[PDB]
Structures are given as C-alpha cells and as structure tokens.
Design a protein around this ligand. Structure first.
Ligand SMILES: Nc1nc2c(ncn2[C@@H]2O[C@H](COP(=O)(O)OP(=O)(O)OP(=O)(O)O)[C@@H](O)[C@H]2O)c(=O)[nH]1
Ligand SMILES: Nc1nc2c(ncn2[C@@H]2O[C@H](COP(=O)(O)OP(=O)(O)O)[C@@H](O)[C@H]2O)c(=O)[nH]1
Ligand SMILES: Nc1nc2c(ncn2[C@@H]2O[C@H](COP(=O)(O)OP(=O)(O)O)[C@@H](O)[C@H]2O)c(=O)[nH]1
Ligand SMILES: [Mg+2]
Lengths: 26, 50, 430, 442, 238, 55, 430
C-alpha cells in the first residue's frame, strides 16, 4: 500500500534527522 | 612517565581524596585517557544546531 | 521591598556566585531551589531576593552579562549554578579585548538592548522596587564599559530609586593588565555623575586581610569574593529581618551623603579571626567596635589616618543591648575628636538587628565616608599622566573611534573630584 | 575559537611536522585521525576544535596548508607516518625552487602557485565560525620563503582585511650562515613583514643551538630539537584558548597589551624550564625561580641582549601549578631589580595568564617532565641592534653589486635595493626615538 | 461587487444611503490629499531585446471632514517653560561650551575673553544669581564667580521666581514611584523638550547563528561584519 | 609592486597632547548658592482636574 | 453559529491539516470520526466546526482546493486525513507556475464554478452561518490567484457575513521565489478592497519565535503551522464555550476597525516557553500580559515601537478573576501611553472564557491594530518599484493577458493604504 510506505519512509527520515551531527555531516 | 597525570592543586591529592573548590572549572568527559581540563561549551554553544 | 542584582564580567560573575551561595545558606534554600529552612523568620522575607517558581522552587533575581561565554559555562558548572534561570544569561561572541572603547561602543551597543529587556522584565515584576546592586571591576573591559553603559540606562529609567555599585579598582602594586589606567579613569568619570553611592575595594587590601588577620596559607580569589559577598549580604540584613532599630539603604544614603558628589565609601566587616585564635576570645560589642575601626580590617588601600570622617554607619546583627552600642559610639566620638569633621556635631549612625548570620552570635558591618579616598584617585591619575603624555597605547582607542578630548574630559572630572574632597577636608568654621 | 596555520618552504614544513606531532599527542588524535568519544549526546569536549575538524566518518583533519616549490619535503610528508592525517589537497607542491632568489619567488614562480594557496585558505575560512587569526611559519633567508611569503601576506592582507596575522620567522643568524645571498632576501623580506604583520616573533638558530648545548646536555643537536622547542612555545601561547584556567588570554589581548604603536610589533620570546632529566633531581622549580629564569639572556631564542635596551611590555603565560599570589610576588621582585629596565612611559609593564594544563611530553624528546612552566613574549628596543648586523652585510655586498645581475635578470629593478635599505634605516630610527626617555620644552 | 451596487441593492432608507456614500466620498478625497509616493514608470532609454520576441515564445503566447476639537480645562497645570523652549538637544550644551573654552585656554597657555551674548535668559539668570550671592555673602560676585551661570540649568517656579533644577530628569518617558507606580511623559524636572527616543528593530538579525544583518541602504539587502558593523547603525525614529 | 601604507608613523618625543586641565572654583560657596536657589519637586501624582472644569 | 473554513494551496492545506488536528483533539473526535470525549460541554457546540453524519460520525465543513494533486495525496496520507469528505477535494491537472495571472484568469475560471458549488452546498446547510475563515499565502501562485478570486465571489454571494483571512507574505530575507513582489502587490490590492479583517504572518517572525523563545534544535514547517493553528483556534474559543464575558468575531471587528480600510491586524499568543525553561517560571496573568505585548511574541517583522496602537483585543481562556484582567489591561494602557492613539480614551477590549486549550490551565491570544504594518507594505512596494521600472519579468503576465494598468492601479491603491496608516502613526503637536 502506498500510504504505509510513505509513512514508513517519513518515520525513518525523522529517526535519522533526530541527531544534529547526522543531519549536518552524516 | 608519558601517560601519568601530574599531581596538582586543581586535580587534588589522589591518595587522600582532598580537593579544593575553585572557580574556572567545567564538566568533565568520563572517557579514558582524556584530560579533565578540556573546555566544555555545550550549555552556551549548542553545536550543530540551526 | 525588592532588590535586583546585575553581575558583569568575570569578577562580577564570580563574586555573584559566592553572594548567592551565602544568601541561599542564610535562608536555607537547597541548591535544587527547594526551601528546607527551620524557622518562619527565614521564609517571611524570602521574596526580597528570590522569586517563586512553580511547585516549591525559588529563582534568584539576578542578570548575568559577559562578553565571552567562558565564565558562563563555569558558573553554570558551579555547585549552585543550577538555581539560575537559563534565559538570564546574556553573552556575546568576541571578547572585550581589555579595551574600554570596544566594550562601550562596539559590542556594548550590540548587547545592551537585551540586558535592558531582562532588567525591565525583572523590575516590572516587583510589587515595590528598591535599588539595584551591581558588582564589577573598573580595570577590565566589558565590566567597565558595559557596566557604566547599563548604569546610565538604568539611571535614565529609574531616577528616583537607589543606584548601588561594588567596584574593584586596579592595585598600584599588582596589576594583571597594562591598560588599566584608561579604563579606570573613564569609568570613575561615568560613576561620579551616575551613582548615588559607590563602594570601592582594592585586591591588595583583601590579600592583607587574608594573610595578616586570617593567616590563610594559600588564599584564592574565592576567599576575596567570599569576604565581598559577606559584606554585600550584610548591608541588606535590616531590610529583611526584624530588629530594635530598623534601617534602610535610603536611610543610609540620607545619613552618609552630605553633598551629591561625595558618595564614595569605605567598607569593613568585623568578626574575622584565625582558627588557632578562636579559642581565646569570646564575641562582645567592645571587640566588634575595636575591630571595625582598625585599619587592618578596612577594604581599601587608603588609610583613615591621613583623612577625616565626614560620616559613618554601623549595622549590628544579634541579640544585644542598645546601651552598649550608644555608649561605645559616644566614647569613640568623644575620645577621638581629631578624626571627625568638626562642622558636623555627630558623625556616627547606629542600627541594631535581631537576626545574626547562622552560626555567629553577633556581627557588624561598617560603612565609612572618608576624604582619604582622594589618595587612590590621585595615584590612578599619576599612572594615567605617565602613560598619556607619550600616547603610549592610544591608537587602539582612537581606532575604535575616540577623540583625544574624551581623555582630557576624564582627567578634568577626576581632578575636580579630588579638588572637591581636598577643599572639604580643609574647610573651617571661621 | 580556531586558528589556521600556513607553513611555507623547508623550515616552515619541518617546524610544522613537530608542531602537529605535539598537538596530536596532546589532544590524543591517533596517526590515522581517529579518536574515541562518548556515546551520549552532551557529554563531550571541544578543545580539539581550535586545531582539528572531524569528518562524518570520524576522521580528524587539521587546519593547515603546507606550501613548497620543490616536491621533496612534501613528498616526505606524504610518505611518512602521518600520511592519513592530512587531506591531500592541503599538501601543495610546485615543480622547481626559487633558487635563493626573492625576485624569482615574488615575480616569476610564486605568481603561478599563489592562487591555489589562496583557494585552499578560502576553503578553510569558509569552514569556520570564530576565526581569530593566521599563524605563519617561514624563513626569510631563502628565496621561496621570502618571496612567496611576502606575496601571500600581501594577498591575504587585501582579501581578509582586519583578521590578524602572527608570524614565527627564522631570521638570518648574526655569524652562523648557510647561503651567500641571505642579506638581500632578508632585507627585501622585512619591508613586507613591516607592512603586513600584527606581531612578528624573531628566531635565530644560533641561539637555540646555544640553549640546547648549555641547558640541555646534547653534544650534536639537529633541527628536530629546535623545531620541538618552537612547537612547545606555540603550544604554550595557544593553550589559553584550549584548556580551563584562572586568567585566560585571548589573542586580541596579546596585541592590545604588547603593541604600543602600530609599527613597533617585533617581539622577543623565551621559555623557562628547559632542563635535562639529571638537573630535575637537583633543582627546585618554584614560580619565582622560573620567573627569574625567563629574564636570563641565556634563555632567549633570538640572539639579542635585552640589557642594551629598554622593555616596553611583557606578557607572562603560566601553565601548571601556579597561584596568582606567587605570580604577584615574583613580578614585584622582578620589578625591584635594577638590571631590568622599563621605559618611563610604561609603569604597569606586565600582563599575566594562568592555565591549568601542564606541558606535554613527546616520546623522543629531550626536555624533562615538569609540573609547571612559564613562557614570555616581550617588546624591547634592543631588537634594533639585530637589524643593523644584516644591514652591514647588505652594504658590504651591495658596494660592488656583487650578485645583483641575478635579481635584475629575473625581473627586479635595482631601485628596490635602495628603497628597502632606507626603510630598514627608518625602522631603526623609530626604535631609537620611541625608546628615548622623557622630553624637554625646547 | 462595487460599493454602489451593494448600497443600491440594500434595504436601507434613502437618507442612510446618502450618508454612507458621502462618507465614502469624503474618505476618498482626504486620501487623495495626503502625501504619497509617486507611481513608478518605465525608463525611456531601455535597450533592445526587451521588445523583441522568439518564435517558440510567440507560439506559446495567445495574445472639511475631520474637524479639530482641542478642549481646554480651567486651571490646568503649566506644561511649558521659556528656558526649556530656548534650549535645543542637537547642539552643544552650555557646559560643553565652557569646557571647549577652557580647553582652548589651556592649549594656548593664556586667557581668552569670552563672547558676549544679548540673550534675555542669560541676563535674567545672572540677576537671580547675583541676588542669591548677595544674600548669602555680603559681597557682590566677581567675574570669575559669575561663570557658574553657564554650568547650571534654570527654570521658573509657579509664582514667577527663578531657580535651579538640581537633578534633571530624562526627556523621554520615565518612572516616579510612590504608593503607586506611574509613567510621566512630561515632568517639571525635565530640561529639554519631551521626545520619544528612536529604537532598533528587533528582527534585524537572521533567524540563526549565522552573522547576517539587514543593510543600511535599503530595506531588502543584507550585510555582514566585513569592514563595518551593520548592527550598530539600524536605529531609526520610524 | 605593493605600495600600500597600513600603519601610521610613530609620534615624536616632543609631541604632547593638551592635558592637566583644571577648573578653579570655591566648592563650598558654589554648593551653598546652588542649594539656596534650588526649586522643590515632588514625586506624588499631580492633582487631577475635575470633569466639570471643561470650558 | 457555524464557520466555514477554506484552505488553498500547499501552505494553506498544511496549516489546515494542523488546525483540524488541534480542533479534533479539543472536541475528542477520533480519527475514525467517532466521539470519544469525556464531557457534555464538548457536545453542545460541536456543530460550530463539524457537521453530523448518521450513526455518530462527524465530518469537517472544509473545502480543499489546489491546482496540482500532490498536496491532496499528502493530506490524505496524513494522520487525520481520513475524516475529510471525499467529495470536498477539488483539484486540477497542472500547476500555477508561481504566476498570479495563470492562477487567477486561465486555470482559475475553469475550476472556480465547482468550488463555488461546493461552498454554496456547505453554506446553505448551516442553520445559522457565521463568517468564513480562509488560509493562504500571498507570495505563491494558486494561493494568491484562486484565493482572491474565491474571496471576491463569496463576498458577492454573502455580503452580510464576515470575511476573515490569515495570510503569509514573503520575507525580504528568507524568500523561496523571485517573482514574489508582483504576486504580493496584486494580492494586497485585492484584499484591501475585498477583506473585512486580514491577519499577516512572516515566516521570519515564526522562526524567531521558535529559535529565541522555544529554543527548538531542528525546527520544521509543522511547528510553524502549529503556532498559526494555535492562534486561529484561540480566536474562536469564546464562540463555542461558556465564559464570564462572551465575545464574537463581529464584536472584534466592531471594536477594532475605526475606518473601513484600516482592517489589517497583528497577532500573538502568550504562553510560549521551552521545555527546559518551563520549570523556572510559573504562568500568571501579569506574565501572559507582559509576553502578550512583547514584540518578541508578535508574528510580523514590523515592530510596534515604530507606530502607535489604535485598538487592541485580548481573549483570555481559563478560570481567573476579572479584577486581575481589568487592572492588568489598565496598567498596560497607562504604562505605555505614548504608543496609544490619544483621541480614543481606552483602546483595549478584554474577554474571558472558562475552558483553556488542552494541556494549559490558562492562555491568552492577542489581536492588535498597529500602524507599524505600513513598513511591511512599503518594503514590498520598494522591491516592486525596482523590478517594475526595468520591465524585469512582465512578459509572463502580459502573455497571460494582464494590462500594465492593473499593475499601476494596484501600486496606487497600496500607496494610498500606506499614506493612511502613515498620517495616524505620527504625532502632530501643531
Ligand atoms: N630552525 C630551523 N632552521 C631551518 C630549518 N630548515 C632550514 N632552516 C634554515 O633556514 C634557512 C634556509 O631557508 P630554506 O627554508 O631552506 O629556504 P626555502 O624556503 O627552501 O627557499 P628555496 O631554497 O628557494 O626553496 C637557513 O638559514 C637554514 O639554516 C629547520 O628545519 N629548522
Ligand atoms: N576580587 C576578585 N578580583 C577578580 C576576580 N576575577 C578577576 N579579578 C580581577 O579583575 C581584573 C580583571 O578584570 P576582568 O574581570 O577580567 O575584566 P573583564 O574582562 O572586563 O571581565 C584583574 O585585576 C583581576 O585580578 C575575582 O573573582 N575576584
Ligand atoms: N508556514 C508555512 N509556510 C509554507 C508552507 N508551505 C509553503 N510555505 C511558504 O509559502 C511560500 C510558497 O508559497 P506556496 O504555498 O507554495 O504557494 P502556492 O504554490 O500558490 O500554493 C514560501 O515562502 C514557502 O516557504 C507551510 O506548510 N507552512
Ligand atoms: Mg628549498
């Protein structure tokens, strides 16, 4: 389903960008 | 002699535990092999913030 | 009757840290901010220095300002640092460079609006505001420039209140910086116009207090700042505890200042004695009276023996008789008539307060208005004239933008202050 | 909160190897650029930030460029032990040397290489948020160091403007010499150093050889010893930015306290506990004794005697176990001495600094390990005597135009010799005039 | 839909319609009267390649009213002074002029006579000062002692006496504290005319740690700390 | 060729600024005369005017 | 008393999504549409924002419009997207291209009839209709063109209701598009004739709110849209809950607008504080009022200190005394008297509502009519004059069909609006 994949991608992106160092230079 | 920390007034006595309280100190990293007098600036400079 | 504190520069922030430690101890406030005291007398005036935050907590009404954040991380890291409100720390990015013009004109004007916003936030919250209290050094860079700038703005906004300053001035003997005379001269020019009452302290006098009276083996700046915090917390004691003869900062100003420019005072605190000696002497009003006038216990390099007292004030803390206070002040006034200005019939005011600092049976703080303070300013002017005649380091200040005429203004104003004190010293009844 | 180092030519790159070896070992970065840290956000330091930046893979890389016209020394850095520490773009090398000609470096050859250096420095300055100066290492005796160092300082002074440039310079020694044409290059160099530097520290190899023979017990010293001493001095001056202390000193405080007039910016440097291990057993090392040591002319790293001049300002940096009261007692005792003289217009002659981190020990080093040290940088009129010995050698060679045809053929007008010689004469007269006691109404 | 259509299609009576339309017309006229900014016009010498076109682009194309009431109250307090009116804030004060004269005398190493002015305020102040000096001491003041008139601020009392303001107040708004707190725009202790000081814009800097400010030349360009400080010169009255 | 001039020349030892400026006055008499001429002031609110006193 | 909301373009659709999350939370509506609340006070006014469909569920009276369906697929993918009625999403097949003329004349007229049909179907279903609420950006393409087209048609069809707009306008400092000045000027020209009351927001002001006040480490557009959703949901609180002094959108308009063209207002919401700082300061009516007038808490770049307030309104939510509200608003009027227009004797209206926003015991929203809004329009007009004098990009608009006279009319109308604000901003002693 498209909605499930979009929600999953957004959740993983939010998990990645939570660390400021990783947002800067990951 | 290349690795031991010199005994100071600001490090206190290691074999008695006494340590004078003075101005100019900052929080200390607990990692092994690091000096305790390294500067700490997280409170006033949140690094990598935007 | 609420006081607002301003802490400026490294010296000011460190003295402030020790002051708030002393005040938190006297009112039984835990370093987490929780009240843990053991008498209602402690709680009933807590509002004077602390505001109440939600669920038990108390926060201290103080503003911290500095041009480099190195000190601010140190005070936040200190044992009581957590009590301070995070929004109350104001800091820049580049240092004062030990330059008065840089601290006053370039980074001063950049930060001054945010400090005035915080000071207004603190002042407008009080139901009735008493004077401000400021601690700073005159020899530094951000302390001198931004302290005098902020004093000028607060004096514009609250001209009917009291303006009080505690100020450190460079020793003629142990300087840490070469350009001290310029910063000191410009700052005293600002203070003599702006202030209502100013206390001056020499680091040399605190070292002599520690070594001769306390016999400390290894004194540190923490001890000097502890002595200063002790007197600062002592002057306000009658504002916040009951007593047989109440007193107030405005009452001190009215009794101490004969004319508006003569507002520079000497400081002392009496019960100081080494741990070896403590077993040999009990506290009593004669002992406090003898120590309070002993020049060994005075916090300035000028000595009373070269001048005359216009006025003096003594505030006593503790359970004691009023007869002994009155008779001691009468005996000293009658026996020592040569050290008192003769066209004033009685120079000493006394005050008595019931609540001593915890763990001491009695204490007294002494404030003195003596013409010998003119000797310090003349000495600073000598070092300035030696440096100024040769334009020794002037290009830094001129590069910031000052006209040389400002230096001549500061010299003329200091010379007029010395002349006015000298003329009142040699006045006569005729 | 950061400083960028620019290393030029042979002496500057070799001194750079010792400096970065010390800064790595003092902070703890491994030779491949790795350093373990804490896994929880907020419990971490920053002292490395002055000299290193970390990559997203966790490698550390230093804020430096290495500039040379011959490949050999930079290829030696590329093949040595620190191969993985430096970014390869930072190590810049040309094809052929400036052949001891200032004219060849300034006009013909440095003109080709200078734009790559400026592009690298720009890429470094863009990755900063509180840059507070440039540190430059070079020798004025050689062709590329003099010519390209001058050209690069001129370009930096136009592009960056107010930013400070502090130079550590190896000047030609008064009787030890390595090349015949040293006076011409040093004279032409000093005009650029006069216009485009905020503080200049002068060094002579003959003084550091004397210091290593007298204080240390080394019979056959080599350049690595001198470079390790220079690295210790630079580490002492920059420690005030990197570690906790009682009295910090920002680089602008040095310029404010040490420089009285904008041209009077040449300073002498000395370091106190230079002592061998055997001596440590029999010598106390109190604050007052090392303070007394810093004033002995046997301690200086430049061959000049300060008793032939007057001091204008002194800056004393204490690191280690020192208490401010002991510093005050020492400075008052120095002030009492009659062999130490200050100009009468400078009554408050001293600046003090106190830092808690004691000096680091390097595995192959020759200095003993000590709990405290003091380092001094001071401005004195005696330095005018140092320029006179180079100018005399210039007059001796120029009276017969001994080698001028190389400079004129490589692109320089003969007039530049006379202009530079007149500028050094005016600088000598400025140091004579500023140091004259008092004045008169007529 | 225009206002005329709505008014004509509404349920109001005729008189209210006329009143509303007249109000709108009067507002329009008063708007026309106001100072304005001129409408922009394209330049005359504009180059080519602005009126030209391209084949693809050509294929894409389809081708009085506000009366003034100033009520006056009997016995209202006096809020003006002659001495206050004479002085101005942009020029040098009298004490500054005195210092300039003393500086010139010290530089030239000789006494310089002062200029004589025919201002009536100076004469009134000198007469009052001479009377006070004669009351305090039997002598008349000398020329040297009459220089004190320049260093002081003078004002009239309510009954017409001439006095000296010991402690002047700020010419902007300030606080007088009593049993209640109050703001006074004007107070008799003020020396200069009342005015509202200019303030710096709160949103001048970028929303971030980067050092970017707004330019001093226009409202949209940006600037940084390169060779000048843009944060100190953003003060404006409006 | 660079011909820029960044640093100003050092001053002569005889060049001195105007300094040591002093004003001369008798502070006792001046202070007494200023105190005599001083106008009284009050920090209490000014008496409010009634609504009937409108013209 | 029912409100109909319209959300247009990507910014409008995103703010609408956050608004409907906040409103669904306050009335306890599950994302399936089922009522799961815990007090009857929630049900008695649910009609104000929701219509009831059979078998319990509620659906929100909102129309979703955009020219490209990307946002609609994003909102359908959102956490509350399912609640929306499928027939209420209207979309085209090609974008606005950031062009006002494209959004208004060519693709606008094709869809506008279907939007008017849906809006009329929604309006005629209400038993009593209150004003419309519209969210859109003025700098975009479909937001500006179709929003102003729809505003004109709804004002023709419902002239007796209220028309309220919340609008975001491009920063001169943080812009995403080059042709912003044309779209902004034409949109302001349409709004000043068509609107009854218009609120303006700068993204720069919300970023300064987040960074300085909230200390957010990594802010996102969701936070910006929450601040906007908070003020919009706060203005309507007195319409849908009981209170001691009720208020209404029409009552706000009657007290705020002195003359019909002066209907542009500033907004603020007081209780904003970072999670670390909140432990140090309790909320109270003096604190909310002081933050409420603090320009740091105002959502536009223009500063109130450069103008004067004609009128202001404060709506309080929570259980509180009326004496503190009245005396605080009197104290703020008395203390800053120079910033209030003198020919109006009292400029502030107050209102009190019993039910606060979820998670706060009390809150206040502020609406202000201040002449400093003229600085924003002047800045946009300046950038327009730089671009228009050189015919910088006009061929796009002229190719769509616009007459240059439209540009000259819009410029003249905005210049007259700026002049009207400028006469009232400055004092006139005469
Ligand atoms: N202290 C010290 N002095 C050095 C060192 N290397 C060279 N010198 C001295 O510096 C001078 C030579 O300058 P160089 O650096 O070789 O000149 P260059 O920069 O290579 O210029 P070119 O020869 O044209 O390439 C001589 O006086 C050497 O004694 C070193 O590593 N340490
Ligand atoms: N008594 C006392 N003096 C201090 C303290 N810290 C610094 N000083 C003195 O103040 C002077 C330095 O001024 P500083 O506070 O650094 O100026 P700033 O840079 O403008 O803040 C020197 O004379 C120091 O000895 C302190 O904690 N206590
Ligand atoms: N506060 C806020 N601003 C937005 C949002 N989406 C876009 N913007 C801003 O609005 C402008 C773009 O306008 P846009 O909404 O794309 O116009 P449209 O294409 O007609 O819908 C830019 O300044 C964006 O930064 C949003 O969700 N919240
Ligand atoms: Mg070489």
């Amino acid at each position: 389903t498209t909605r499930e994949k979009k929600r999953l991608f957004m959740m993983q992106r939010a998990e990645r960008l939570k660390d400021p160092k990783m947002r800067h230079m990951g | 002699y290349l690795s031991d920390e010199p005994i100071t007034l600001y490090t206190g006595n290691p074999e008695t535990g006494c340590t004078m309280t003075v101005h100019g100190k900052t929080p200390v990293e607990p990692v092994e092999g690091r000096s305790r007098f390294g500067r700490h600036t997280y409170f006033t400079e949140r690094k990598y913030c935007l | 009757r609420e006081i607002v504190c301003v802490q400026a520069g490294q010296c000011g922030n460190q003295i402030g840290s020790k002051f708030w430690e002393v005040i938190s101890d006297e009112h039984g406030v835990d370093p987490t901010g929780t009240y843990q005291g053991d008498s209602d007398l402690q709680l009933e005036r807590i509002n004077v220095y602390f505001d109440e935050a939600t669920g038990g907590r108390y926060v201290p009404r103080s503003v911290l300002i500095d041009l480099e954040p190195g000190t601010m991380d140190s005070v936040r890291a200190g044992p009581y640092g957590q009590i301070f409100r995070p929004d109350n720390f104001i800091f820049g990015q580049s240092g004062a460079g030990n330059n008065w013009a840089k601290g006053h004109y370039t980074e001063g004007a950049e930060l001054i609006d945010s400090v005035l916003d915080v000071c207004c936030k603190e002042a407008e919250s009080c139901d009735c505001l008493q004077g401000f209290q400021i601690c700073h050094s005159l020899g530094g860079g951000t302390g001198s420039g931004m302290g005098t700038l902020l004093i000028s703005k607060l004096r514009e906004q609250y001209p009917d209140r009291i303006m009080m300053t505690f100020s450190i001035i460079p020793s003629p003997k142990v300087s840490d910086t070469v350009v001290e005379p310029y910063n000191t001269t410009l700052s005293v020019h600002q203070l003599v116009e702006n202030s209502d009452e100013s206390m001056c302290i020499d680091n040399e006098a605190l070292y002599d207090i520690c070594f001769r009276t306390l016999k400390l083996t290894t004194p540190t700046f923490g001890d000097l700042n502890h002595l200063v915090s002790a007197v600062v917390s002592g002057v306000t004691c009658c504002l916040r505890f009951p007593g047989q003869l109440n007193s107030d900062l405005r009452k001190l100003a009215v009794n101490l200042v004969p004319f508006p420019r003569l507002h520079f005072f000497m400081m002392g605190f009496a019960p100081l004695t080494s741990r070896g000696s403590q077993q040999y002497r009990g506290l009593s009003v004669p002992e406090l009276t003898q120590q309070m006038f002993d020049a060994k216990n005075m916090m300035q390099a000028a000595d009373p023996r070269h001048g005359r007292y216009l006025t003096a004030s003594a505030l006593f803390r503790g359970r004691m008789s009023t007869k002994e206070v009155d008779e001691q002040m009468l005996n000293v006034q009658n026996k020592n008539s040569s050290y008192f200005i003769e066209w004033i019939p009685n120079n000493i005011k006394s005050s008595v307060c019931d609540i001593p600092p915890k763990g001491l049976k009695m204490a007294v703080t002494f404030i003195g208005n003596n013409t010998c303070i003119q000797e310090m300013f003349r000495r600073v002017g000598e070092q300035f004239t030696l440096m100024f005649r040769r334009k020794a380091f002037l290009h830094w200040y001129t590069g910031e933008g000052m006209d040389e005429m400002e230096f001549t203004e500061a010299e003329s104003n200091m010379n007029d202050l010395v002349s006015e004190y000298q003329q009142y010293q040699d006045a006569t009844i005729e | 909160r950061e400083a960028i180092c620019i290393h030029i030519g042979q002496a500057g790159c070799q001194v750079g190897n010792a400096c970065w070896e010390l800064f790595c070992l003092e902070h703890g970065i491994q030779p491949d650029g790795a350093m373990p840290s804490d896994k929880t956000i907020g419990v971490e330091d920053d002292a490395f930030n002055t000299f290193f930046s970390e990559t997203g893979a966790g490698k550390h890389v230093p804020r430096a460029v290495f500039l040379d016209l011959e490949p050999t020394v930079v290829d030696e850095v590329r093949t040595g032990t620190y191969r993985q520490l430096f970014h390869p773009e930072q190590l810049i090398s040309g094809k052929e040397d400036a052949a001891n000609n200032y004219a060849r470096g300034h006009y013909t050859i440095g003109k080709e290489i200078v734009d790559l250096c400026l592009d690298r420095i720009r890429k470094l300055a863009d990755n900063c948020t509180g840059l507070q100066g440039f540190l430059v290492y070079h020798a004025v005796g050689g062709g590329t160091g003099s010519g390209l160092g001058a050209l690069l300082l001129e370009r930096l002074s136009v592009d960056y403007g107010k930013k400070s440039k502090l130079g550590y310079t190896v000047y030609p020694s008064p009787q030890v010499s390595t090349a015949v044409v040293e006076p011409y290059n040093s004279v032409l160099s000093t005009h650029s150093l006069l216009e485009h530097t905020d503080v200049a520290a002068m060094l002579d190899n003959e003084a550091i050889y004397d210091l290593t023979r007298r204080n240390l017990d080394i019979e056959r010293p080599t350049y690595t010893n001198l470079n390790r001493l220079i690295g210790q001095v630079v580490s002492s001056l920059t420690a005030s930015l990197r570690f906790d202390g009682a009295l910090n000193v920002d680089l602008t405080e040095f310029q404010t306290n040490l420089v009285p007039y904008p041209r009077i910016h040449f300073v002498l440097t000395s370091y106190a506990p230079v002592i061998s291990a055997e001596k440590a057993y029999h010598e106390q090392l109190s604050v007052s004794e090392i303070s007394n040591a810093v004033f002995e002319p046997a301690s200086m790293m430049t061959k000049c005697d300060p008793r032939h001049g007057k001091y204008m300002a002194c800056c004393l940096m204490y690191r280690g176990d020192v208490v401010p009261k002991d510093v005050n007692a020492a400075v008052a005792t120095i002030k009492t001495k009659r062999t130490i003289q200050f100009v009468d217009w400078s009554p408050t002659g001293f600046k003090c600094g106190i830092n808690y981190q004691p000096p680091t020990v390097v595995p192959g080093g020759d200095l003993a390990k000590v709990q405290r040290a003091v380092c001094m940088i001071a401005n004195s009129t005696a330095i005018a005597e140092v320029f006179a010995r180079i100018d005399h050698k210039f007059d001796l060679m120029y009276s017969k135009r001994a080698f001028v045809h190389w400079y004129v053929g490589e692109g320089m007008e003969e007039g530049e010799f006379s202009e530079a010689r007149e500028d050094l004469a005016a600088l000598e007269k400025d140091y004579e005039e500023v140091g004259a006691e008092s004045a008169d109404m007529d | 839909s225009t206002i005329y259509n709505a008014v004509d299609a509404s349920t109001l009576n005729d008189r209210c319609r006329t009143d509303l339309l007249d109000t709108v017309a009067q507002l329009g006229r008063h708007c026309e009267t106001l100072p304005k900014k001129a409408v922009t016009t394209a330049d005359a010498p504009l180059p080519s390649c602005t009126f030209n076109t391209t084949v693809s682009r050509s294929q894409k194309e389809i081708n009085t009213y506000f009366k003034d009431h100033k009520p006056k109250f009997h016995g209202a307090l006096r809020t003006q002074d002659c001495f206050r009116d004479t002085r101005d804030i942009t020029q040098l004060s009298s004490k500054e002029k005195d210092f300039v004269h003393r500086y010139a005398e010290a530089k030239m190493k000789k006494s310089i006579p002062r200029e004589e002015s025919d201002d009536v305020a100076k004469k009134v102040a000198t007469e009052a000062y001479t009377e006070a000096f004669r009351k305090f001491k039997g002598r008349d003041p000398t020329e040297k002692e009459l220089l004190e008139v320049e260093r002081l601020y003078f004002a009239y009392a309510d009954d017409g006496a001439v006095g000296v303001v010991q402690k002047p107040h700020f010419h902007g708004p300030h606080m007088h504290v009593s049993i209640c707190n109050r703001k006074y725009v004007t107070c008799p202790n003020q020396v200069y005319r009342a005015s509202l000081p200019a303030v710096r814009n709160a949103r001048s800097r970028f929303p971030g740690p980067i050092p970017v400010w707004t330019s001093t030349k226009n409202l949209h360009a940006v600037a940084s700390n390169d060779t000048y400080r843009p944060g100190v010169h953003n003060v404006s009255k409006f | 060729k660079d011909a820029s001039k960044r640093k100003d020349d050092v001053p002569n030892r005889y060049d001195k600024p105007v300094m040591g400026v002093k004003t001369e006055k008798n502070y006792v008499v001046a202070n007494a005369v200023e105190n005599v001429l001083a106008l009284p002031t009050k920090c209490i609110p000014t008496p409010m005017n009634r609504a009937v006193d409108r013209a």
